[PDB]
Amino acid sequence: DFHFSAIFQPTDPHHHQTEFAKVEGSEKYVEEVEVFGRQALKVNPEALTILAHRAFSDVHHFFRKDHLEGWRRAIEDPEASDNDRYVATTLLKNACIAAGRVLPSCQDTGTAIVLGKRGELCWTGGEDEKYLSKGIWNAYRYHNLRYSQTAALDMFKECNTGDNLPAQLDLLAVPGSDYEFLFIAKGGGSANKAYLYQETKALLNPKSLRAFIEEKLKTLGTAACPPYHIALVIGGTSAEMTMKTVKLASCRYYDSLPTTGDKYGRAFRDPEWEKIVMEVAQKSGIGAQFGGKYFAHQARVIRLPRHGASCPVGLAVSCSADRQILAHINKSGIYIEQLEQNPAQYLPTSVKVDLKRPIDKVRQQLSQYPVGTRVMLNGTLIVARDIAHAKIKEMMDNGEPLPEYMKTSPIYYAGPAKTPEGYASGSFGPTTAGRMDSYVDLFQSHGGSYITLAKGNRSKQVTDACKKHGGFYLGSIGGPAAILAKDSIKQVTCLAFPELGMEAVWKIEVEDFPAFIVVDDKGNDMYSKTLA
Amino acid sequence: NADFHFSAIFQPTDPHHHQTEFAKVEGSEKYVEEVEVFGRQALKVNPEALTILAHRAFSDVHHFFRKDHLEGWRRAIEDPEASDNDRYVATTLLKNACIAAGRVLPSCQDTGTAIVLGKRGELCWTGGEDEKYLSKGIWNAYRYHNLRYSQTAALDMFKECNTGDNLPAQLDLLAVPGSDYEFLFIAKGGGSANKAYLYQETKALLNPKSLRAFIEEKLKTLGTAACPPYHIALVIGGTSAEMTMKTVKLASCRYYDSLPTTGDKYGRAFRDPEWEKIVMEVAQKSGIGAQFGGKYFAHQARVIRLPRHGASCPVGLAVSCSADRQILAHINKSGIYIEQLEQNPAQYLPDTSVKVDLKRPIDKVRQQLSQYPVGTRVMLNGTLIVARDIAHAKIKEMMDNGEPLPEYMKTSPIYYAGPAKTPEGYASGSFGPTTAGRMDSYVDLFQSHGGSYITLAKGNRSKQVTDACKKHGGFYLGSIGGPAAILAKDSIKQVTCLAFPELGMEAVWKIEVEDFPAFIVVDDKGNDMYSKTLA
Ligand code: F3S
Ligand code: F3S
Ligand SMILES: [Fe+3]
Ligand SMILES: [Fe+3]
Known part of the structure; x- marks a missing residue:
């Protein structure tokens, strides 16, 4: 019936x-x-x-x-x-x-x-x-x-x-x-950490599912400003339905679902596997951005019905914002x-880094410290992210030089919010570094971008580039855009491409800007153990 | 409020x-x-x-x-x-x-x-x-x-x-x-639903050279597992992953065919006929063809460009299949x-094939198949044992618990399929093949225990299956994907449930077939019909 x-x-x-x-x-x-x-x-x-x-x-x-x-x-x-x-x-x-x-x-x-x-x-x-x-x-x-x-x-x-x-x-x-x-x-960065996997019945056993969770959580990395609210959805009636569900799960919209399934295929939250996700997140050592226990705030796991031939799986996070x-x-x-x-x-403690020097002197100072060292930056940063990097690569492809402003100062990947009246800066926290990875070796080979400042783990090509060219990647804390604006950013000027809005090239003067040395000039990567 | x-x-x-x-x-x-x-x-x-x-x-x-x-x-x-x-x-x-x-x-x-x-x-x-x-x-x-x-x-x-x-x-x-x-x-269908893919890309993709290389790479990963010729839909951008994936589904259904074909400063969606032509060119030049090599990998293409957060570029790729x-x-x-x-x-x-008698010892069938290269079209006559995802998982679980591979997995070729209900007075309901790739993890294990030497399904398979068939003297036969009704009407002569009746269409069946067409996709020598087009 x-x-x-x-x-x-x-x-x-x-x-x-x-x-x-x-x-x-x-x-x-x-x-x-x-x-x-x-x-x-x-x-x-x-x-x-x-x-x-x-x-x-x-x-x-x-x-x-x-x-x-x-x-x-x-x-x-x-x-x-x-x-x-x-x-x-x-x-x-x-x-x-x-x-x-x-x-x-x-x-x-x-x-x-x-x-x-x-x-x-x-x-x-x-x-x-x-x-x-x-x-x-x-x-x-x-x-x-x-x-x-x-x-x-x-x-x-x-x-x-x-x-x-x-x-x-x-x-x-x-x-x-x-x-x-x-x-x-x-946020765009946490939206980018919504992943869809097309799996099979071969996944649906305790051993295979646990190994799957360990593998996929690492691919989240630190690129979306953890501690994360981690949502995992197993099954679904279509890819888009799986991805909608994992989004809503990450917002705790489905917290009151049943916790058991039935023969009619109703969705349910799975507290046992939420605990397993949390255990994986803690045991990973990834931590709250820079190593430790607090990779995740909490976890949500929803099990959905599926076509016999299908097993879509969704993984997504809610970030610090x-x-x-x-x-x-x-x-x-x-x-x-x-x-x-x-x-x-x-x-x-932390190392004071004076940026008001020739960039080669800054590189020399940074070379004296291992990855994981906390630094405090004082001086000028040049700000550039996705579209500016793309326009600059296109200029070089047409025979034009790497612009001078990419060679004088560390490059801060960021895009500011609007400046309040009477404030030096609007909120101004870092952009995900990984999106610029394809430019690092090229720009360094052309004499710039030796020091970059952003958030998140980066790919091996960036580690290889910094070792080859004597470069560094500094990881800002991800998320604290308002306190950085209030306490650290003292002057903001639009330098190039004003038509790009927040994606224009900016020149900013900063004081007491905290960061960690994530990639050094020697082949070392702060994330090489936890995100291997 | 004026702006x-x-x-x-x-x-x-x-x-x-x-x-x-x-x-x-x-x-x-x-x-x-x-x-x-x-x-x-x-x-x-x-x-x-x-x-x-x-x-x-x-x-x-x-x-x-x-x-x-x-x-x-x-x-x-x-x-x-x-x-x-x-x-x-x-x-x-x-x-x-x-x-x-x-x-x-x-x-x-x-x-x-x-x-x-x-x-x-x-x-x-x-x-x-x-x-x-x-x-x-x-x-x-x-x-x-x-x-x-x-x-x-x-x-x-x-x-x-x-x-x-x-x-x-x-x-x-x-x-x-x-x-x-x-x-x-x-x-x-579940198989075409499984070929809905989400990619998290960047502004670095958004130039003609990078996008064309991306399309070439991703279209091949669709393979033949969802019964082409495909309606191929590609969505570049979107306000969220789920919105991108919803759009690519609806695009594949031609639901968005009347969208504008140019963007504007307000970020409206548009269909891009120029890149639809490029998608079709890539699909045709791929040589993958309508399942078994050729030009007709795709019926047509739909490409929708969407607005995006500056930090984001979700991309969706999906197909509508033969069904x-x-x-x-x-x-x-x-x-x-x-x-x-x-x-x-x-x-x-x-307005051309090798007859294979399956009513022989399985080792004689293997010996006959070994005489032919991949790409040979065969016509199967005799008994098939039918099993797919859940039956394979249950049998592996039994073996993990010390039980033997059941004898009915060793006597006949294994047909991955799950039948629809049988019409009154008919020998069989619609009864076409399951995607072979989903069973890839079982082939080497089962062949090591003296069964599943010959499998019959649809789609390209992973390298572990090519290696298994070469190691164990096995074969993978590719049925045409899609024609479930003509197979039921003309080829399937008898259907009986052999094991696991509680699984419904996923039960193990024993069926008798005549004039069942297939291609030798993987042989016993390391050869794979798809090794060039899907490399
Ligand atoms: S939106 Fe979220 S991913 Fe980081 S940059 Fe802001 S806390
Ligand atoms: S639903 Fe579609 S993917 Fe093949 S098995 Fe039927 S034509
Ligand atoms: Fe990102
Ligand atoms: Fe499939």
Whole structure:
């Protein structure tokens, strides 16, 4: 006999476990009505603008408790490494600055993502996408965020949209008369660490699955600013469904799923394998970016049904800029998840490197120290990331020289957020180093980029280049964009390619900028043991 | 507020698919009623319409194809640049479609995962139980027709059982403007679903030389495991991995065919016909062909360029296979409308092999096969033992526990397959091959224990299988992938369940076949038919 079984059966489908605050006066935007014997809700679409604007404002300055608790755990655990505690303390101090509501917690203010669930009898006028986009537009235009979206004019010619649009707007049709939301400000680097694997029944045994988990976690590396919220999804009805599920799992959206399966194929959370993921993450030694125990805050594992011939697997993380906010509109008005507004309640040597010298003198100083040495940089940095590197490679391919500004100073891979009025800099933390790996040997062979400064582990070609050319890769702490801007960056100037927006080449003057020597000029790599 | 400009990512010029031919379900206007509430037009829809619609969609789609799919098979037959094997495979698939058009046998034994993309208007009122009513219609189609129950439930992380009804479905129901209900139904095979790939790339990819080299490298990794000729879809960019993968799926269904062909400063999606031509050139010059060498690796290509976060460049690659099964539909004030597929595929048909007797000692069959090079076409006559993913896993588990390889794995060639349900009065339901590569990890082990010397399935296999067959005097025979109905109708003469009946279509079967075509893909000498094109 026919029995309908929804794949996802949360015990808390409306997220009653979350605390919400009502937007004052927002009941003027809604009206409960009764039509053809059923209860319905008229929603002024301006409510969607108001809600999206506040969601994408609040989320850049505050965090959830389970995120902040993880940083406290890394500081207080006796088994945490010194580097575990240093990174966690830095990230918590960064959250305190961001809670001042001026600087966003990260320079990568992310892609704006909206999961919306509009009830059958929730009536907005139907222009939901436009009104939500206006609210997102408002948040990024009138606050000190960043325009990160890149439009394709043709296959290869690109320009910044200049407003952080388009958003990802996933609006679902559901029962009832309410409007429920999950807003995500998703960083590009953590988005890049969403992986899809096409596996088989041969994986579905304890030995093979455990070895698989050990192998894939290492490929996450430190490139998305751990401690991670790690999500793993085994199975699914399609690749895109698997990847949607792992995204939502990483946002703890599916925390109230059942923990057992049944003959109808319902999804379930697997706490036993969540513990195994956490054990793998801790035993890996990767740590909170620079070696140790706190590779991961927590883990989510969801098992899904599958076609007999198929076994898609999804792996994804939420990064240090863990940014999601639940919301709903009902007959009483607009409700938005309440985040932690006082992160300070969770708070319980190094080599000085003078950059105001010839670069060869800086290289000589750095050559005296092994990888893992903590350094403090003082002086000028030249800032360049993906598009600038690509344009410079193209210039050299056309016979033009490597520009002088790539040869005078360490290269900081970064793209700043907008500068608050009266501030020297907006949030200005590092870009993932690995995306520039294909340029290092070329630029060094042409006399520049001997010293780079960014975050994340890099490929072997960069280790080989630095040894061949006498170069160095310095790893900044990943994530603390606001405290770096507040305490370290003293002057910012646009140097080249101003049309690239945040991806322009910048010249900045810094003081007390912390980093680790990750790759030296001798073939050594701080990550060679943990990420082998 | 003056500089704000809203731009939807997807701006099709034909959003309601007026270019598609639809048929009205007779009398279906009785399921809808136009009303007016708060000055706005709304449509009340009896949810039983959703059951009727889903039932007909997942019945029609298993027996008929779109014109653009059938035209590709005709092109492979009529093109002078097509190889002999290209024409042979395309002719076989067209003949298979003529059988499937009889509405008894489905076109493929893998009747797929049921996928529904639904777009419910703000003022389209169904009562809200859409997922249940759609699932009941899907349940009806798979229960009362000669399809297959393919969905595997997880009782725990590792303990599995077949759901016995091909549920659950993938139901993606979206909230959109208006008062109509629009649908795309997909019956998605597992093998083509497995060839949906996500790559996390960078700006370093986004130049003509790098992108062309990337396409050349990735298209080969598709191999022949999803029964080409493919509809190849490639998506460059996206706002998230899941959005990229959703887009590449819909692109492969030609859902986005009416997108613009140029970008703008607002980041709208666009189809790129120039790079679609490049994808087709790469696929043709690859020499992979329609499964067995030639030009027709691909029917056609779709390339969609998407906006991206500056730090990101997700890329999606996916195919629609020979069982190219999607059907558009909509409900409006006039009733239920369903896309009209081609009911006379025979009009696309236009106006050498070694006979292998399997009713011999297996060692004599091996001795005969050893006389021929890879690429030789054979015709099999006799008994096959049928086993795929779960049966192989269960047998390896038995052996790991000290038990012998069962005798029934040593007496006959092993056919990887899982049959659809048998029509009344028929010897067999649709019964084409499973992807060989998924069983690769068992071949050397089983051959070391005196069985699985000869396997029969579809797709290229990994090097460990070539090494095993050379070490153990084995062979891998490649069936044509896709023609499950003509194989059932013409070649499969008897089917009996031998072991593991609780596995449903994944049980071990003993079947008797006649005139079953295949190619020698791997021989007993280290040779592989795909070693040049898929290197
Ligand atoms: S968005 Fe996340 S990956 Fe790092 S650069 Fe910002 S914390
Ligand atoms: S569903 Fe498609 S991949 Fe082959 S086995 Fe059937 S034609
Ligand atoms: Fe990255
Ligand atoms: Fe497969």
